[PDB]
mmCIF file with all atom_site columns, N, CA and C in Angstrom:
data_model
loop_
_atom_site.group_PDB
_atom_site.id
_atom_site.type_symbol
_atom_site.label_atom_id
_atom_site.label_alt_id
_atom_site.label_comp_id
_atom_site.label_asym_id
_atom_site.label_entity_id
_atom_site.label_seq_id
_atom_site.pdbx_PDB_ins_code
_atom_site.Cartn_x
_atom_site.Cartn_y
_atom_site.Cartn_z
_atom_site.occupancy
_atom_site.B_iso_or_equiv
_atom_site.pdbx_formal_charge
_atom_site.auth_seq_id
_atom_site.auth_comp_id
_atom_site.auth_asym_id
_atom_site.auth_atom_id
_atom_site.pdbx_PDB_model_num
ATOM 1  N N  . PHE O 1 1  ? -32.679 71.913 -69.500 1.00 36.04 ? 100 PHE O N  1
ATOM 2  C CA . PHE O 1 1  ? -33.156 73.766 -70.154 1.00 36.04 ? 100 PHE O CA 1
ATOM 3  C C  . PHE O 1 1  ? -32.889 73.851 -71.321 1.00 36.04 ? 100 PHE O C  1
ATOM 4  N N  . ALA O 1 2  ? -34.017 74.552 -71.946 1.00 35.56 ? 101 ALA O N  1
ATOM 5  C CA . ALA O 1 2  ? -34.234 74.549 -73.313 1.00 35.56 ? 101 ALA O CA 1
ATOM 6  C C  . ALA O 1 2  ? -34.197 72.899 -73.794 1.00 35.56 ? 101 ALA O C  1
ATOM 7  N N  . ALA O 1 3  ? -33.959 71.963 -73.517 1.00 36.74 ? 102 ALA O N  1
ATOM 8  C CA . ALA O 1 3  ? -33.643 70.764 -74.289 1.00 36.74 ? 102 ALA O CA 1
ATOM 9  C C  . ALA O 1 3  ? -34.034 70.860 -75.632 1.00 36.74 ? 102 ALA O C  1
ATOM 10 N N  . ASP O 1 4  ? -34.764 69.986 -76.227 1.00 35.58 ? 103 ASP O N  1
ATOM 11 C CA . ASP O 1 4  ? -35.263 69.901 -77.437 1.00 35.58 ? 103 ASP O CA 1
ATOM 12 C C  . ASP O 1 4  ? -33.739 69.993 -78.427 1.00 35.58 ? 103 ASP O C  1
ATOM 13 N N  . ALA O 1 5  ? -32.954 69.300 -78.101 1.00 37.43 ? 104 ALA O N  1
ATOM 14 C CA . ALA O 1 5  ? -31.622 69.004 -78.706 1.00 37.43 ? 104 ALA O CA 1
ATOM 15 C C  . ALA O 1 5  ? -31.280 70.412 -79.631 1.00 37.43 ? 104 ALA O C  1
ATOM 16 N N  . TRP O 1 6  ? -31.479 70.440 -80.920 1.00 36.11 ? 105 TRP O N  1
ATOM 17 C CA . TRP O 1 6  ? -31.015 71.331 -81.847 1.00 36.11 ? 105 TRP O CA 1
ATOM 18 C C  . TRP O 1 6  ? -31.967 71.162 -83.019 1.00 36.11 ? 105 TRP O C  1
ATOM 19 N N  . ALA O 1 7  ? -32.381 72.188 -83.632 1.00 33.11 ? 106 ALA O N  1
ATOM 20 C CA . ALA O 1 7  ? -33.020 72.131 -84.897 1.00 33.11 ? 106 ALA O CA 1
ATOM 21 C C  . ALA O 1 7  ? -31.806 71.830 -86.398 1.00 33.11 ? 106 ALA O C  1
ATOM 22 N N  . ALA O 1 8  ? -32.087 70.901 -86.541 1.00 33.82 ? 107 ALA O N  1
ATOM 23 C CA . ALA O 1 8  ? -31.260 70.434 -88.007 1.00 33.82 ? 107 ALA O CA 1
ATOM 24 C C  . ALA O 1 8  ? -29.648 69.853 -87.346 1.00 33.82 ? 107 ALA O C  1
ATOM 25 N N  . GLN O 1 9  ? -29.708 69.859 -86.041 1.00 34.59 ? 108 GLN O N  1
ATOM 26 C CA . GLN O 1 9  ? -28.507 69.283 -85.516 1.00 34.59 ? 108 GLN O CA 1
ATOM 27 C C  . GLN O 1 9  ? -29.178 67.535 -85.900 1.00 34.59 ? 108 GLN O C  1
ATOM 28 N N  . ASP O 1 10 ? -29.877 67.196 -84.754 1.00 35.55 ? 109 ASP O N  1
ATOM 29 C CA . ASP O 1 10 ? -30.572 66.084 -84.921 1.00 35.55 ? 109 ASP O CA 1
ATOM 30 C C  . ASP O 1 10 ? -31.272 65.696 -86.200 1.00 35.55 ? 109 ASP O C  1
ATOM 31 N N  . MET O 1 11 ? -31.158 66.273 -87.227 1.00 41.17 ? 110 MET O N  1
ATOM 32 C CA . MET O 1 11 ? -31.873 66.246 -88.595 1.00 41.17 ? 110 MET O CA 1
ATOM 33 C C  . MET O 1 11 ? -30.664 65.289 -89.168 1.00 41.17 ? 110 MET O C  1
ATOM 34 N N  . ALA O 1 12 ? -29.462 65.548 -89.195 1.00 41.31 ? 111 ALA O N  1
ATOM 35 C CA . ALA O 1 12 ? -28.459 64.725 -90.060 1.00 41.31 ? 111 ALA O CA 1
ATOM 36 C C  . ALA O 1 12 ? -28.170 63.401 -89.082 1.00 41.31 ? 111 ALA O C  1
ATOM 37 N N  . UNK O 1 13 ? -28.663 63.406 -88.077 1.00 38.19 ? 112 UNK O N  1
ATOM 38 C CA . UNK O 1 13 ? -28.581 62.132 -87.111 1.00 38.19 ? 112 UNK O CA 1
ATOM 39 C C  . UNK O 1 13 ? -29.122 61.215 -87.884 1.00 38.19 ? 112 UNK O C  1
ATOM 40 N N  . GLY O 1 14 ? -30.582 61.569 -87.907 1.00 41.19 ? 113 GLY O N  1
ATOM 41 C CA . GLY O 1 14 ? -31.385 60.141 -88.386 1.00 41.19 ? 113 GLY O CA 1
ATOM 42 C C  . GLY O 1 14 ? -30.963 60.212 -89.960 1.00 41.19 ? 113 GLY O C  1
ATOM 43 N N  . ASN O 1 15 ? -29.985 60.434 -90.558 1.00 41.31 ? 114 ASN O N  1
ATOM 44 C CA . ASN O 1 15 ? -29.466 60.048 -91.757 1.00 41.31 ? 114 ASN O CA 1
ATOM 45 C C  . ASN O 1 15 ? -28.486 59.053 -91.745 1.00 41.31 ? 114 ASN O C  1
ATOM 46 N N  . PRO O 1 16 ? -28.359 58.454 -93.226 1.00 38.92 ? 115 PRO O N  1
ATOM 47 C CA . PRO O 1 16 ? -27.711 57.340 -93.352 1.00 38.92 ? 115 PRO O CA 1
ATOM 48 C C  . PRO O 1 16 ? -26.626 57.098 -92.252 1.00 38.92 ? 115 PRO O C  1
ATOM 49 N N  . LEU O 1 17 ? -26.964 56.283 -91.225 1.00 39.32 ? 116 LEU O N  1
ATOM 50 C CA . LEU O 1 17 ? -26.106 55.616 -90.204 1.00 39.32 ? 116 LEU O CA 1
ATOM 51 C C  . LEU O 1 17 ? -26.258 56.683 -89.208 1.00 39.32 ? 116 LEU O C  1
ATOM 52 N N  . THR O 1 18 ? -26.066 57.850 -89.497 1.00 37.18 ? 117 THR O N  1
ATOM 53 C CA . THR O 1 18 ? -25.853 58.862 -88.622 1.00 37.18 ? 117 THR O CA 1
ATOM 54 C C  . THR O 1 18 ? -27.153 58.657 -87.713 1.00 37.18 ? 117 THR O C  1
ATOM 55 N N  . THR O 1 19 ? -28.167 57.699 -87.834 1.00 37.34 ? 118 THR O N  1
ATOM 56 C CA . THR O 1 19 ? -29.126 57.594 -86.615 1.00 37.34 ? 118 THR O CA 1
ATOM 57 C C  . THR O 1 19 ? -28.207 57.517 -85.356 1.00 37.34 ? 118 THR O C  1
ATOM 58 N N  . UNK O 1 20 ? -27.844 56.135 -84.927 1.00 35.73 ? 119 UNK O N  1
ATOM 59 C CA . UNK O 1 20 ? -27.074 55.770 -83.911 1.00 35.73 ? 119 UNK O CA 1
ATOM 60 C C  . UNK O 1 20 ? -26.149 57.235 -83.725 1.00 35.73 ? 119 UNK O C  1
ATOM 61 N N  . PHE O 1 21 ? -25.338 57.697 -84.601 1.00 35.86 ? 120 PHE O N  1
ATOM 62 C CA . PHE O 1 21 ? -24.574 58.569 -84.445 1.00 35.86 ? 120 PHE O CA 1
ATOM 63 C C  . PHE O 1 21 ? -24.993 59.619 -83.451 1.00 35.86 ? 120 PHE O C  1
ATOM 64 N N  . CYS O 1 22 ? -26.014 60.304 -84.035 1.00 35.96 ? 121 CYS O N  1
ATOM 65 C CA . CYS O 1 22 ? -26.630 61.547 -83.202 1.00 35.96 ? 121 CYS O CA 1
ATOM 66 C C  . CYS O 1 22 ? -27.892 61.098 -82.355 1.00 35.96 ? 121 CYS O C  1
ATOM 67 N N  . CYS O 1 23 ? -27.707 59.791 -81.999 1.00 36.65 ? 122 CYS O N  1
ATOM 68 C CA . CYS O 1 23 ? -28.648 59.313 -80.775 1.00 36.65 ? 122 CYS O CA 1
ATOM 69 C C  . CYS O 1 23 ? -27.914 59.610 -79.467 1.00 36.65 ? 122 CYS O C  1
ATOM 70 N N  . UNK O 1 24 ? -26.512 58.790 -79.161 1.00 37.80 ? 123 UNK O N  1
ATOM 71 C CA . UNK O 1 24 ? -25.632 58.824 -78.103 1.00 37.80 ? 123 UNK O CA 1
ATOM 72 C C  . UNK O 1 24 ? -24.677 60.385 -78.187 1.00 37.80 ? 123 UNK O C  1
ATOM 73 N N  . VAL O 1 25 ? -24.839 60.916 -79.542 1.00 39.31 ? 124 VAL O N  1
ATOM 74 C CA . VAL O 1 25 ? -24.225 62.448 -79.803 1.00 39.31 ? 124 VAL O CA 1
ATOM 75 C C  . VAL O 1 25 ? -25.000 63.199 -78.865 1.00 39.31 ? 124 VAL O C  1
ATOM 76 N N  . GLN O 1 26 ? -26.254 63.218 -78.995 1.00 37.54 ? 125 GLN O N  1
ATOM 77 C CA . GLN O 1 26 ? -27.516 64.119 -78.496 1.00 37.54 ? 125 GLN O CA 1
ATOM 78 C C  . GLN O 1 26 ? -27.930 63.628 -76.784 1.00 37.54 ? 125 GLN O C  1
ATOM 79 N N  . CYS O 1 27 ? -27.766 62.205 -77.095 1.00 35.60 ? 126 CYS O N  1
ATOM 80 C CA . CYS O 1 27 ? -28.064 61.732 -75.690 1.00 35.60 ? 126 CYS O CA 1
ATOM 81 C C  . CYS O 1 27 ? -27.289 62.488 -74.451 1.00 35.60 ? 126 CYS O C  1
ATOM 82 N N  . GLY O 1 28 ? -28.161 62.692 -73.444 1.00 35.12 ? 127 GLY O N  1
ATOM 83 C CA . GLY O 1 28 ? -27.064 63.134 -72.201 1.00 35.12 ? 127 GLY O CA 1
ATOM 84 C C  . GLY O 1 28 ? -26.936 62.311 -71.243 1.00 35.12 ? 127 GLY O C  1
#
């Protein structure tokens, strides 16, 4: 419900290395 993770939250994910960091972090 609501999905769309979060605005700005998954933005620092796609950051240097944050990538995978925010992939599993935001993954359900």
